[model samples]
Target: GDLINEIDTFQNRIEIDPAHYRRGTDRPDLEGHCERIVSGSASIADAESTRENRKQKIVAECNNLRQALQELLTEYEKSTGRRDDIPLGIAEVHKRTKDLRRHLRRAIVDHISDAFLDTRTPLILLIEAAKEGHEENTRYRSKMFQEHANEIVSVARLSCQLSSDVESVSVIQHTAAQLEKLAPQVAQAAILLCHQPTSKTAQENMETYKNAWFDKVRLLTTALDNITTLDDFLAVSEAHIVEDCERGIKGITACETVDCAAGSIRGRALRVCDVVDAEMDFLQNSEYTETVKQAVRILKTQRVDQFAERASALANRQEAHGLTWDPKTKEEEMNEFINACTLVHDAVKDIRHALLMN
Candidate 1:
């Protein structure tokens, strides 16, 4: 499973041309093996393949991949080259493998997005069951309650496993383990309430556990979201927009290409803001919350929307003036688009600094 995961990650990393920056010396043998590894992994990832087919393919591919890697490494060791100097071709190969491992290790924003939850309903249901004073019903509800708790713990563990942020992962791992361990205490409190539903003391004890569970869940959610920072997404999207804009300005790519790239960044910014605002529900009024709110507000109202507007305008203007515009008008429009993109980049960087730094 880890092998397939690593390969999938490598494929994603190299979806763009891997040789662009390095221009590595062409080693057909290395290229051939890596490409085969890539293709086999992709086949495994593909949902269209039959279960038996995939299983068979994975078994054969895994064996071959191991052999391929061994052969490639041996080739490198036997070849005449300074270890300190490092051949560029092999350097590219190493980079690709490292990309596979590093990217696989980190939780992307999408994974973080899926990990958040609302524990209110489950808490309320369990409390309601406890108040009924029926042992059978309370036991059943406690089972469900424990199941929910376990799911939350599992998701938290997965987040830590995927996340690259060391400090946040340590915090999350400790908090999540606490919550898992705390689940039984909460269930025992519910059982106590079930036995003496009419007692005010029982109600109070249940309340204490409720509050504890809620607080732990809240803190865990915040920590997970915090670790899934915006830097990578922002930087990647920013570079994409810039490169697409360059291509558009040079007339090497279509207007739609840059427009689509602009739209993606805008959407990603809005989604990230929405996620942060959702996180605010678990947070109390504090400098952190206020600062986050301010950053999200500005990003949504001032930066992303304007970026979208500028992109739309550029596309529409290009459509309306197909070969009819003068050079002066074309020059001005391109310049305006570039300026708008620059502002978006600046805003993204500012938000990153605000959210991740003190």
Candidate 2:
């Protein structure tokens, strides 16, 4: 049941996932091949083990594809300033504020614009007062709520926050509300004003002050749009990377496992080779001193290719220049190659056995 489940699931994926088709495992014979594998397993344990082995094989190659793509993406950025290489697209994507980058743009926009509601009225007045002033009988408000050019600028600065802590929204709202009611305190610090002051504080000066808020909105909107654009781009790039990996997997015919074998002298031997990433992703030092805090980097980054790389190369070479080559001769050479691999495997087995005996 276990073995059947694995193969059935795999067969289902091969049939359903566009990924497998792009990878070309569209072997018309795939289901039959899976049947043979299931029948060959001796126990549920054996079937489960084989399934795990194949899972590893697929993941390793997929990871290889993933890394190469990400590295190229980085270099492409350094050269071209765009994230989408389409490396294949003739029309590849022809491609920040530091503070804006620290959080999701959507969240930032919400922070900037939760942006309106009615006890919301006073809050609205404060925010808008910092913008264009209410006329004496203005279209938007009554005279009691108007602000001077400098008062708006002062209060807008007060609205700026360096952090968002626990209960931050309500907290900031309270703080902003306090500033709004403290409008007189804020405005009093400024030069006295009439409904019309044509001093150096003329319409021109007040208009300039109003633009201070306008410019801030324009800049904030631009940053918001930029972040929104980035997320859209990220969604598209993720789709392409998976598609590219799927297609790349199709070309990887080499078996990565170490147990490939044949039905007879002429066919195959031990068929379980698979590949996996050899990179070290996470590491840290031990608490004990004189314990190797200094580590050797030698082994990890050497990602595996299918153990079958040599086998395929040898097989391909034998296929060239061929009427002159004999199947008998080919079989002999192939068997010799496989046998050498078998011997190395046996050597490890025997060494392990020797350890157990001792």
lDDT: which candidate is best?
Answer: 1
Candidate 1 lDDT over residue span 1-358, tens digit each: 2343445454343332322323243334445546655564444334232234334444454455455454444444444423222244344445546544334323233333322423566678788989988788788878878887887787676656445467787888889899999999899898999999999999999999999999998888778667554454455444554555676566512244556556555655665666667766577878887887888788789887788888788778777774577777767877877787776667666666676754
Per-candidate clashes, comma-separated? 1, 19
TM-score of each: 0.45, 0.19
Look at candidate 2 and tell me the lDDT of residue 179: 43
| Reference-based TM-score, model 2 | 0.19
Worst lDDT run of 10 residues, candidate 2, spans: 270-279
Model 1 weakest 10-residue run by lDDT: 14-23
Q: Which residue segments of model 1 deviate by more than 4 Å?
A: 1-75, 81-88, 91-115, 229-274, 278-358
Candidate 2 local accuracy as lDDT? 0.31
lDDT, candidate 1, residue 244?
A: 51
